[PDB]
Every structure is written in C-alpha cells, then in structure tokens.
Design a protein around this ligand. Sequence first.
Ligand SMILES: CCCCCCCCCCCCCCC[n+]1ccn(CC(P(=O)([O-])O)P(=O)(O)O)c1
Ligand SMILES: CCCCCCCCCCCCCCC[n+]1ccn(CC(P(=O)([O-])O)P(=O)(O)O)c1
Ligand SMILES: CCCCCCCCCCCCCCC[n+]1ccn(CC(P(=O)([O-])O)P(=O)(O)O)c1
Ligand SMILES: CCCCCCCCCCCCCCC[n+]1ccn(CC(P(=O)([O-])O)P(=O)(O)O)c1
Lengths: 341, 341, 341, 341
Amino acid sequence: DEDLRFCYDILQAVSRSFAVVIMELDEEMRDAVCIFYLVLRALDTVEDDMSIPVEFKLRELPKFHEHLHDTTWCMSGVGVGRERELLERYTHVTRAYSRLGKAYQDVISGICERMANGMCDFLTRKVETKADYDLYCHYVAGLVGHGLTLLYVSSGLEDVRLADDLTNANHMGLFLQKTNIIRDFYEDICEVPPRVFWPREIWEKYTDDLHAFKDELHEAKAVECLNAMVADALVHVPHVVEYLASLRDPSVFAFSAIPQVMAMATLSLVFNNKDVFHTKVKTTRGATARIFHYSTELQATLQMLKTYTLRLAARMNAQDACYDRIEHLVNDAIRAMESHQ
Amino acid sequence: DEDLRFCYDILQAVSRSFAVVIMELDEEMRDAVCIFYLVLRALDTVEDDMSIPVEFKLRELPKFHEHLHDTTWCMSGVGVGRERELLERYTHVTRAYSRLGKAYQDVISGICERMANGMCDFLTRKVETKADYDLYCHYVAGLVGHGLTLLYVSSGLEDVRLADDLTNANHMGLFLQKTNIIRDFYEDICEVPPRVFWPREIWEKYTDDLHAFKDELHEAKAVECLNAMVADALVHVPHVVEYLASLRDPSVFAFSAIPQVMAMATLSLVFNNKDVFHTKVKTTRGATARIFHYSTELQATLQMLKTYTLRLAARMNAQDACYDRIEHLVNDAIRAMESHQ
Amino acid sequence: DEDLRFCYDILQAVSRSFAVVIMELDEEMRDAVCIFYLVLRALDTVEDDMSIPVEFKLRELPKFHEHLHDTTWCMSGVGVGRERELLERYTHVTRAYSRLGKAYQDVISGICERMANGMCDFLTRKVETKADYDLYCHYVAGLVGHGLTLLYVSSGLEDVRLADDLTNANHMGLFLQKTNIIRDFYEDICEVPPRVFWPREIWEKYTDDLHAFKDELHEAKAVECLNAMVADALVHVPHVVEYLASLRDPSVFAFSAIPQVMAMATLSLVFNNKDVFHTKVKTTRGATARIFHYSTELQATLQMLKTYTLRLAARMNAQDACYDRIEHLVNDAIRAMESHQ
Amino acid sequence: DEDLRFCYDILQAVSRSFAVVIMELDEEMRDAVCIFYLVLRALDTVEDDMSIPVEFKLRELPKFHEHLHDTTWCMSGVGVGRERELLERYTHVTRAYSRLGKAYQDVISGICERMANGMCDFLTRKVETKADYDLYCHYVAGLVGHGLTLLYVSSGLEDVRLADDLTNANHMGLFLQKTNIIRDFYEDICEVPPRVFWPREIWEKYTDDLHAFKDELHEAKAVECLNAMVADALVHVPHVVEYLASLRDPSVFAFSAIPQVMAMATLSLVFNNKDVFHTKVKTTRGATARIFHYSTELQATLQMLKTYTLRLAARMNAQDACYDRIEHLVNDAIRAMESHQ
Ligand SMILES: CCCCCCCCCCCCCCC[n+]1ccn(CC(P(=O)([O-])O)P(=O)(O)O)c1
Ligand SMILES: CCCCCCCCCCCCCCC[n+]1ccn(CC(P(=O)([O-])O)P(=O)(O)O)c1
Ligand SMILES: CCCCCCCCCCCCCCC[n+]1ccn(CC(P(=O)([O-])O)P(=O)(O)O)c1
Ligand SMILES: CCCCCCCCCCCCCCC[n+]1ccn(CC(P(=O)([O-])O)P(=O)(O)O)c1
C-alpha cells in the first residue's frame, strides 16, 4: 500500500516522461511495469555514477538482481538527486516486488541481471563498431523491449504468440534509444566527463575527434554524420510498425505506440538539423498532446508515423549526400505502414 | 534552409509577442505563419512610412503581393531600425515563400493583397463612423483572422468546415486589434503626427478635440469615452469563445487562445482606468506567464476568460454611466463561456 | 482608493527591496500582501524604538492587531522617519484593510498578533542559545512566511495543500533574516544602543566580547565565527528549495524565489570575508538585476542557487577550521537542488 | 588575498576613473580585468618614461609578458608616483595573475605581448597618416577591446559568438582613445618632448606647425582642424552602438557602456570648442554621476548617447565647414541607435 505509492512518487520524479505514458496501463499491469522500471533505473544509477571505482560495479552489478529478494538491502552514497533516494530507500521497491505475480517477478529479475551484465561488458570498453552500437542499445533499451513484451504476455492481455520472436520487441527499444542518443548529442558531450555513444565506425568517416562538431566551423561535416546516424535509426522503423500491428489490447497498445510516434516525431526534427549540435531539439507541447490523443488505435498512429517520416524525407535535397540512402529507408518505412492500411 | 533562419531572427526582433506565441505551432504550420506575418509586416512598414508619397502607395501597394513571386525584389530606403532590414533583405522571405505549398502561398498572397487595398482605402480618408472603425480593423486584423483560419484548414489540422463562415474568424481579429487600439491611446496620439484610431462617432460624444484627453482636465470625459471603447470591444467576446470552441487541434488552439486571453486580461486593466491616458497599462509577467501555461485546452482558457471578464465588471459601480451598457455585454460574454463548460 | 494609494507610496519609502518584488504579484494578491507588510512594519517601529519605555510596549503590542478594526485609530509619539509617518497616518492602512477579503483579513490579523507577543518575549531577555536564535527569527521572519503561504492558499492561486506543514514556509523567513543579520553585523553593532543578534552559543567559542570583532586584531577569530553563522543559515537552504518547488503559479513563485536567490547571493559574498566586520557587503546592481530577470521559473532559479552555493564553497580552503562542516551543508543543498532538476 | 588587495589599491591610485567603473563587474571577472588593466598599465609606464633610453624600451617591452610567470620579477628606476611603485612591487600582480583561471591568463598575456610590440613600433616614428592614427589607437586601445571582449566570452557571461569578429570591439577602443587624444591635445603638446598624436594627414590642411594652434592667432584654423578630428571619431559610434546592443549580461554591459557614454559626452563638449587649445574640457561631476546611474540597460544608455550627439550637432552653425559631413555621421549614428530603440 505505502510502498507501491512511493514507487510512483519516486517514478514521477525520476522520469517525468515515462511516468505519464505508464498511466495508460491498467492498475495491475501498471504496478508491475512501475517496479520493473525502477529496478532498471536503480541499476542505471549505479553505472552512471563516476565517483565509484570501476571494479566495484563489476562486482555488485552482476549481483544486483539478488537484492530483489533482500527487502533489507539498499545503497546510500550513489546517485544524483531523487535517484539517491531511490537506492537509500530501495526497500520500498523490493517490498512491492515481493507482492507481484511470480511470473512478473521472474521477468523483472531476468531482464535486470541480463541488462546488468551488458553494462559491465561495455564498462571496460567503448562503442567503436556499429555492432557495438546496436548491442549497447540492446543492453540499455532493447532488453526493455523484451522485458515489456514478456510482461504483456504474462498479464494475459496479449497472446503468448507475441513472445515467440523478440526481434521486433528489440527493435522497438533500439529505436527509442538511437533516436535519443542522436537528439541528445550536445547534451551528452558537454557533461563531465564528456559522454559519447555515436559509433566510431560512423563518425570517423566525417572527423578525427567527435568534439570537433561542437564547432560551427566543422558544421557541414557535422550534419552529414548526423544524417548517417538517423539513417541507421530508420532501419528499425519497419519492424516497429510490425510490432505495433501485432498488439491487440488497447491499454498495452497505446502505452507502446506513443513512445514510438514520439521518437519518429523527434527523429524528423533532428534530421539534417545543424541545431542538434548546440541545443536540444524538441517537439511542441501541442505536438505531443496530439500524439497522446490519437495513438490509441493502429490506423491513427500509422498516419501520424507516415506524416512524420514524410516531413523527415521532405527536409533534404536531391544533391544531398545521404539522399539516395534515406529515400530507400523512407519507402521501406512507408511500405511497412501502408502494408497495414 | 539558411533563408528560413532569417525569417525567425527578423521575426523575434520585430514582434516580442508573436515571436513567442508562434512557437506553439508545428514547424510545417509555423513556417507558413512566420512568412505570412513578415509579408504583412513588410507591407505595414511601407504603408506607415509617411515620407513616402501617398500616390506611390496607392499605386504600388495594391501590387505588393506580387513581389512574392519575384525572388530578387526588395526595398532600400524605407522603415526604421529592423523593419528596414526586413525590406532590404526581403529576399529570404520570398525565397522561403517559394518553398511552401501552393495552398499556403495562395492564402498569404491572397490576404496580403486584400489587406493592401484595404490600407489604401484608408490612406485617403479618416475613420469617422463606427462602421469605418470596424472596416479598418477588418483590413488590418480581421483579415489576419481569415488568413490563419484558412491556413489551419489548408494544413489539415482543422476541419474544412472551419472555413465556411469566416465571421467569427474576423471577431478574433477585431478583439485583439480593438483592445490594443484602446490600450495604446496615449502612445499613438503622442507620435508625430499623432496617430488616432478611436472613431469620431464615439469620442465626439465626449469631447470636441480628442487630444483633450491628454490633459488631466478632461479626465472624467476621458474615462467615459474609454469605457465606450471597451464596450465596443466586448461585442466580440461571445464570438471569440465560439471560434476557440470549434478548434480541435492542440497546437492550433494554444496559438489562437493565448492571444485572446491576453487581450481580455489587458482589457480588464485598461477598463475605467485613468492611467490609460498617460502611460501603457500592462499585465505582470507572472500573469501573462500563467496565461501561456494554461491556455492549452478549451476548459482551462474558458475559466480564465471568465475570471478576467468579472474582474473587469467589478471595476465599475451603479453610479457609473456605462454600468448598464457594460453589464449587458459582460453577461452576454459569460453566457457564451458557460455554454461550453 | 486613496488609502491604498498611500500604502504603496509609504511602501516605496519604508522598504526599497520588498516594494519591488511585490510588483511581481497580481492585483488582488498584491494589495493584501502590501497591507500585510505595512501592518507588520508599523509593529516593528514600536518594538525597535529604544527611546520608548520598555513597558509601554509589553502592554500595547499584544493588543495591536485589535486596532485593525478602528479606521480612525493611530499613533504619533513613535518613529524615526517614514516609520514614524506610517503609525501617525496608520488610518489609511486599516482603512484599506477593511476592503480586503474576509479570508485575507484573518491571515493578517492572525500573524500580527502572533508576532506581537513574540517580540514582547525578547524585550525582557537576550539572544543566548541557537534555540533562542531560531526562535527570534521565526517571530519576525518565519511568521511572515506563514502569513504569505496562508495568503497564497487563501487566494486559490496555490493548492490548499501548501497550508498543511508551515515548516518550510518558516525556513524561508529564517534563511532571509539570518543572512541579513550575518551581513548587517557592523551596521547594527554600530548604534546606541548597539544591536546584537549573533547568539552567544556560537560567538563565545571565538571571543569573550562580540565588539572584539570590530578590531583588526581579532580578524582570524572573526572570520571563523562568521563562517559559523553562515553554516547556521545553510541549514535552511534545503528547505527553501522544497518550498519553491512546491509552487506552481508564476507570480507567487517569482515573488518568493527572487528574495531567496538574493539572500543566497549575499551569503556567498559575506562568507569567509573580513570586510563584513567594517562595511556592508553588497552584490553589484548588475548581479541583482540578472537575478530579478531569471528567477521566474524553478529550473532557472535552481541553476543560479547552485552557482552561488559553488561560489561560496570556493572561497574556503582545507586549512580552514570549518571546511568540513560547510562542505557538508553545501552538498546538502546542492543535492536538494539536483533533486528537482 | 594580500596581493589582490594591493592591485585594487594600486589601481584606485593610478586610475580614479577606471577604478570606479570596474566595480560594475562580478569579482571573478573584476579580478581578471583588474590584473589585465594593471599589466597594461605597467607596460604603459615603461614606455611613457622619457628619462629612459630608447634601446631599453625596445628590448624589455617585447619580453614584458614573460615576467607574468615570474612571481619574483620587478622593475626599479622607472616612472614616478604610484606608477613606479607598480613596477617595483610588480610581484603582487604576478602573484594574483597566477591564481587566475588559465583561460584568463592567456588573454592577458596574449594582449600584453601584442600591445607591447605595437608601442615599440611607434617609438621610432611619428603619427603621420590616418592609417597610422588608426593603427596606434588599435595598439593602445583597440586591443583592450579584444581582451575585454575575449574575457567576457571566457567567463560564460557572454556568448562565445561575441568573440568571432572583434572588429567592433576595436571600434569601442578607438572611439574612446581618439576622444581622449582630441581632448588632451593641449596637455600632450605642452610636455617635453611635445607629444603629438593628431595625424599630419589631417592637420596639414590647416597649418604647417601644429604648435600654431596654441597661439590664439590660429584659433580660427585650429578649431577647424579640431572638428576634422571629431568627424574622424564619430565614424566609430555606429559600431560602438552595435557592440553595446550585442551585450546580454547586466554587469558586463554597464562596465562597457559607461566609458562610451562618458566619451560621447566629452566629445560633444570638445567639439567645435576653442578652449581645447588651452585647457582640459571636462563634464560636470553631476553629469558623469547621471551617466553611471542610467547606463545600466541598452535603452536608457542609447537615448543618452542620442541626447549628447544632438547636443554636439547643435553646437555648430550652418556656415561651419565641417557642417555637412558632421550631420551625415550624426544621423548615421542616430540611425544605428534607433535601429534598436
Ligand atoms: C516495447 C517497446 C520498447 C521500448 C522500451 C523503452 C526503452 C527506453 C530506454 C530506457 C532505458 C532504461 C534505463 C533508464 C535510463 N534513463 C534515465 C533517464 N532516462 C530518460 C527518461 P526521460 O529523460 O526521457 O524522461 P525516459 O526515456 O526513461 O522516460 C532513461
Ligand atoms: C484567428 C486568430 C486571429 C488573430 C490575428 C491577430 C491580429 C493582430 C493584428 C496585428 C497586425 C499585423 C500587422 C503588423 C503591424 N504591427 C506592428 C507592430 N505590431 C504589434 C506587435 P507587438 O509590438 O505586440 O510585438 P504584434 O501585435 O504584431 O505581435 C503590429
Ligand atoms: C514565503 C517566503 C517568506 C519570506 C518572508 C520575508 C521576511 C523578510 C523579513 C522582513 C521583516 C518584516 C518586518 C520589517 C522589519 N524590517 C525593517 C527593515 N527591513 C529590511 C527591508 P530592506 O532594508 O532590505 O528594504 P526588507 O528586507 O523588509 O525589504 C525589514
Ligand atoms: C570593449 C571595451 C573596450 C574599451 C577599452 C578601454 C580603452 C581605454 C584606453 C586606456 C589605455 C590603457 C593604458 C593605460 C594608459 N593610461 C594612462 C592614463 N590613462 C588615463 C586614465 P584616467 O586619467 O582617465 O583615470 P584611464 O583612461 O586608464 O581610466 C590611461
């Protein structure tokens, strides 16, 4: 009663975005996801902290999922802001966890450990190749796509067949992560220490050092690299459409579609936009408001995704580098969409 | 793409108000409105410059909208400060104008012309009758209402029904225009030569000379004439509510609502306020800040309009001459608001 | 109407600080706050006037909020200047107080009485312990915080919630009053009779007599006692952050944030500074101008509070006898801020 | 601590003017500017000392900046008054200089070296042409503009964009310097050996021997050349305005605007004034007092610059030779001013 209430309060504080979308789910399905999120967040808080030894994480992280049964466990000196409160009072999270369905628990605990190890794998190294990039996204976001899908099936709102092949589920998360990584470029590289996610296998093709983009001097090259990043992101769209088209429950659907449409809308604004290198490109509050309202049923979301992918490809020129490549991806995305119309 | 960055830069440095509100619109719709404003603003510059021969205006103004098809046209020695830069570098406006859909282009070019000739009709005659006052407001503001309405329809964000009867779209324009005309009495009449908009058919019932109000001697007759103006403005409120109540899109709503609420707020401060004759009555940045924040949905903005219409009525008592005339318009206004709550 | 036009004029004269921040508020809101301030300022005139017999206060202060219902009452034999004119013409204050909403009048009448008896307590005893210190501030500053919060709720601009735990509303007043005292050390002790607020429990750990700080010889022990007081105030920073983050209405926030940011800025200047013992340390009019400008929304005021708290913790070295105590209270607040970022 | 205190004291003793204005800045910036000024002032002292041989200056000046990293360096037999003390106890400056942000150090050290060599150049040749006149001013003033501007950017107070085209910054300096040169004519030529700065290119049209102007006989032609100088200075005003309108930070604005308004006020008083050839023309202490008070925000200062330029253009008749050209520069100046009003 009290415990679960803390989760939403801490959730509402930690992630103001997700906290909203999650309200689309029904109480039960909602409580599980809330916990599921927090657990992943608490785990994230331990990694993002750069005031704790590297061999310390490689020690506790892989063992983190075991605390989900230790209602007395908690951490105190890690995290920034509300995140700290989440770990120091992690008790509430584990308290609510114990009361969830055994099935839900196994999924949360399962993904937690799987994601944890992935972080350790990328702690002692960086993202150099595309394969590195795609894998990293799988660990931090992709796995959330699996965890969620599995949670949808365990609830019964979706058919079990939905968990047969989690390739699309992975794409879902990878689309949100890659879109954000692109959008939040400047925001990340300005932090201390500078955060980088863009794969060297891609940005090397346009510069020697990534910090070079923060210069209006190397603007031209900067934009090219950007479009290349977006191009890589659009590869997931067709699969995103497929996944959404396989959902049958209203609650589950809306909750899964909104974040996607959101991403597609953001991806259409950052595309070939030099502003991405000096500010945080965002959509109007009225834009998201429209999305949150019309993304309750497939057909509707499809026309919005359609329009945003059109506005994206409509922001380039024939004699522009990434032209030929982008158009192929646009047609692909639209084909997958019209394929469900 | 560089061209477009000029429109917004010049926009921001020419209209502190519009510059912020316009951001409530999505880039697609935003680019159109941005251009639409500048074109109209460039037109205003020419018409206002009193050093330019009357006949040159009457001759060139009716064909101003034609230079939108000329991507090399511009003006050199006209306007002061930034409005001049707008003309000299008018290139970008016409450049960005071309990169717009036919639908939008025809709307802008269409209204520009209609407004242009409207200004001409008043370059050779003063505003004497109330009809003139309204006709004038139609040309300078009302039409701006038609233009936006059409643009809304043309974008698909609003139902094509919205453009069947542009009557209320005109009331939207007059409310803002008339309010400003009232609020900016002193400033306008102080310019050289003094600019007057208050219809003789109204103030003549309170004074021989309109400048007489600049003197605290005729403060009594001044306020009375002021309340006469405010009344003539409260005739559009009901229609303003009707128009905002027909908008379904968030962006198009917020963008249309905010200015209206801002108007009712200012009108509630100038009403029966002697200070209107020796200073510019404004609303605290906090008040106007609260207006931008809440004016996103029909209900919220409706209770704000009501709040300000009441605060305005409470600033008068039985003995006041206008009392009856005002209470009537106030109720007529509130009844409309309630009709949608 | 002419009474209220007197308050502001005397408000501008009495306080040149509050008189500015109070303009951020809306009309209805602003009027009550002005009366609320004056009624209390007038109370401060009697409580401070030393040439007045100590009993002449103990017998009349408890019965001061009573005169709030006598539109003819007043007092002449007290005051030094503007404060003297206020009481003598107090009529206007109670005059306008009569036209305030029933809800408002009580919040004022309540705190006034609650503050009168509080000042009567210290007119028979001195400030010895920290408890006595925090208690005094509460009476003259914290109570003002209570009243203000009560006014926000009474106005409906804020949630009725805000009135449940007036602990932070108290911390607000304390932080300000404490900063003023820490900064106004010299100005106060340089009077007849000399005014001291610094609690013995704190300065007696560095010197036998407080007037010793007026000497260049006891500078080292003057700074330590200084940094000790600054540490005592930093205890309220975290709480202040909470009260500001609990606000929602633009106007109420600014009017409440600007003063807090000011205090913090001042505190980062008087901290670890010897000049505090022979002059009034102030912030450049440009610095305070920047503050008034950016303290409109939470996030903005936060990064500023942060900046100034970093500027304070930067003016101390490891060899300082308080580094640790302060470097602990610094993150206490910094994290409270990051807790809302 | 002990060193910084010296700088501010040696500063207030060497420059009563600059010492007052610098107080508009925030300590961090203020210290950097304080040190920067001194270094350049110590650099000036060595050059202006006429008792020292030429080869000495041409040897030490070029390496002067190097002494910035030698906390044990100093100079003895050079200069008189407090200036001499600045060199002898130069140790203090280097002490504080080292305790400055490495970003500021490079700017001060950078500008110092450049200005130094420049001074060495004009130590072996007279001011002959306008190209020279402008270059000399660039060395001993323009560079001060670059440095000051560079410091603004390196402080975060101003946008990094402000340091892209330091052409206006240079204009800022030249206007000031040229204004002083014009005003201090009599003083510069009454020393031994007579110091002359007015480029031959300009005073050749009025006489063969510049000293002729000290003689009342040539008053008629002296004043005529005087206006030729004022005309050359005004060429910068438009640029000055541009730079000022480019500032966003309050503290940085006042510090940069005040000196400019001071010059324009002095220029309008020296213009077409014969007294320049026998005494020092100054503004009333009240006038300068008024300037400090209002020169806080663009609008106030802009309309203040206006008032003075008009006061200037109003000190000439209709038959004055300079007439025509003057008004052009004036109107062209007021233009840029209204370009923001
Ligand atoms: C079935 C669809 C699959 C989509 C799953 C969504 C994956 C989103 C990636 C979230 C990765 C979880 C680790 C938490 C790290 N974290 C900290 C802050 N945020 C960003 C948050 P934001 O600042 O956007 O409010 P949010 O995106 O979680 O709402 C993420
Ligand atoms: C359905 C919505 C209809 C609302 C239409 C708005 C009509 C407002 C009339 C504005 C007339 C445009 C012609 C330009 C003339 N002009 C010069 C200065 N201004 C005032 C400008 P301001 O100083 O307030 O920033 P703004 O009112 O354009 O924002 C206007
Ligand atoms: C919700 C936030 C709560 C903040 C409450 C602010 C309390 C400020 C303490 C003021 C005490 C009121 C009794 C009048 C005593 N008094 C005499 C002079 N002053 C200082 C005035 P100042 O010289 O700075 O213009 P001010 O700080 O009231 O503006 C105060
Ligand atoms: C973007 C801001 C650019 C403004 C730059 C200011 C340029 C001012 C020229 C000062 C040249 C610095 C070298 C010191 C030589 N010096 C000796 C005496 N003075 C006059 C001094 P004063 O007698 O007026 O107190 P001050 O003008 O330094 O205040 C200057």
